[PDB]
């Protein structure tokens, strides 16, 4: 699980651009305030390599 | 992939023939340059994104 | 003496630093934790 | 690109010679210059 | 390219490496190893009338 990808972001990246910011994403109308919960998910998820 | 490593290749002579002849790489696909012409050209501002 | 370039100017993103101090000209690309008021100050 | 001239802004022509071509490949949207203080 | 390499009197600036004519074809080049500036002139040609 050492390899992670950005599942959620507000906008698409530019060419040759890396995003490593571990900020929470707001998927709904309600603000998340940096805390996980309903419709608040972490952007980086790990691959299940077996 | 979210934190992909970019390495600069500079001030070296590169033999690309040893990359083509080896069989472990499933995909060797080039877009802006011919694969067989890489040994005959000179380049700068070279980066490997891993 | 120099300039600071970036997007958020912190360790979250990657930033470019150009400085010329008393001896030599240094160009660095690092993830700097920049000051709100960065400056230089014989030096 | 840089140019040094021995001298509001003067009215004249001076082409800026390219000084550094830098391969960064990073996003830049905001900048800030660095000054030097004098302490007494 | 195919041409005659001759001495040149064109004062290239330090950043400048090669030169381009009206047609955008290279007319002068800076040789590696020696850093000298060589003028490139196309080889002698003309029409043959019988
Ligand atoms: C660079 O950053 C700005 C805001 O910080 C953002 O809007 C833009 O999409 C970024 N560019 C790329 C290529 O990601
Ligand atoms: C100037 O900066 C470089 C890199 O940070 C450093 O090695 C050098 O000692 C500095 N010069 C002085 C006089 O502090
Ligand atoms: C090799 O080329 C460099 C320029 O890249 C030059 O400074 C050096 O003098 C050359 N050496 C020889 C032996 O030609």
Curated annotation (Swiss-Prot), chain B:
Organism the protein comes from: Severe acute respiratory syndrome coronavirus 2
Highest rank taxon of the organism: Viruses
Protein name from the UniProt record: Spike protein S1
Impact reported for residue 27 to A: In strain: Omicron/BA.2, Omicron/BA.2.12.1, Omicron/BA.4, Omicron/BA.5, Omicron/BQ.1.1, Omicron/XBB.1.5, Omicron/EG.5.1
Chain's role: Attaches the virion to the cell membrane by interacting with host receptor, initiating the infection. The major receptor is host ACE2. When S2/S2' has been cleaved, binding to the receptor triggers direct fusion at the cell membrane. When S2/S2' has not been cleaved, binding to the receptor results in internalization of the virus by endocytosis using host TFRC and GRM2 and leading to fusion of the virion membrane with the host endosomal membrane. Alternatively, may use NRP1/NRP2 and integrin as entry receptors.
Quaternary data: Binds to host ACE2. RBD also interacts with the N-linked glycan on 'Asn-90' of ACE2. Cleavage of S generates a polybasic C-terminal sequence on S1 that binds to host Neuropilin-1 (NRP1) and Neuropilin-2 (NRP2) receptors. Interacts with host integrin alpha-5/beta-1 (ITGA5:ITGB1) and with ACE2 in complex with integrin alpha-5/beta-1 (ITGA5:ITGB1). May interact via cytoplasmic c-terminus with M protein. May interact (via N-terminus) with host bilirubin and biliverdin, thereby preventing antibody binding to the SARS-CoV-2 spike NTD via an allosteric mechanism.
Parent-protein start and end of this portion: 350 to 399 of 1273
């Amino acid at each position: 699980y050492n390899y992670l990808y950005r599942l959620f972001r507000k906008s698409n990246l530019k060419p040759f651009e890396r995003d490593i910011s571990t900020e929470i994403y707001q998927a709904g109308n309600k603000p998340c305030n940096g805390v996980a919960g309903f419709n608040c998910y972490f952007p980086l998820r790990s691959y299940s390599f077996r | 992939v979210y934190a992909w490593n970019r390495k600069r290749i500079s001030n070296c002579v590169a033999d690309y023939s040893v990359l083509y002849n080896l069989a472990p790489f499933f995909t060797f696909k080039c877009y802006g340059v011919s694969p067989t012409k890489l040994n005959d050209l000179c380049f700068t501002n070279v980066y490997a994104d891993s | 003496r120099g300039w600071i370039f970036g997007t958020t100017l912190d360790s979250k993103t990657q930033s470019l630093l150009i400085v010329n101090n008393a001896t030599n000209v240094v160009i660095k690309v690092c993830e700097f934790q920049f000051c709100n008021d960065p400056f230089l100050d014989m030096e | 690109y840089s140019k040094h001239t021995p001298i509001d802004l003067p009215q004249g022509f001076s082409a800026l010679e390219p000084l550094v071509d830098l391969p960064i490949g990073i996003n830049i949207t905001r900048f800030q210059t660095l000054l030097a203080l004098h302490r007494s | 390219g195919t041409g005659v390499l001759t001495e040149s009197n064109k004062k290239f600036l330090p950043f400048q490496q090669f030169g381009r004519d009206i047609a955008d074809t290279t007319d002068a080049v800076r040789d590696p190893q020696t850093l000298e500036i060589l003028d490139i002139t196309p080889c002698s040609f003309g029409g043959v009338s019988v």
